[PDB]
Amino acid sequence: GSDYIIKEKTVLLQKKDSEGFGFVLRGAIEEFTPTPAFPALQYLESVDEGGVAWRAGLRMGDFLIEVNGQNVVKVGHRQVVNMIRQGGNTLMVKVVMVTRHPD
C-alpha cells in the first residue's frame, strides 16, 4: 500500500499589480469525493522557484481547499480560477499537502 503524510495550512499571497502569483493551477462535470491521495479538485501543477507563491510557502502538489474563505474542494477549474481573480493581488488559500511514501 501507501503511507500518506497529510499537512494543512493557510497562506497569504500578495503581488504587485504588474506580476503573477507565480503558480500554475491544475484540476478537473460529474462526481468527485475526497480520498486520502486526492483531497480536492484543484492543486498546484507547479510553483515558480522564486515568485510570490513560492515565497509564501506554497509548493507543487498542494491541493487547494479554500480560496479567500471559500471552500473549493469540489469546485471546477474555471470557477476556481475566477475566485482567485476576484481577490486580485491578495490571495488567502488554505491548502493540504499530501506526500506519498511506499508502505
Binding site: 502569483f21 507565480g22 491544475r26 484540476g27 477549474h77 474555471r78 480560477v81
Partner: peptide, 6 residues
C-alpha cells in the same frame, strides 16, 4: 484536466 498560470 486544465491548467492556468496565475
Amino acid at each position: 484536466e486544465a491548467q492556468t498560470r496565475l
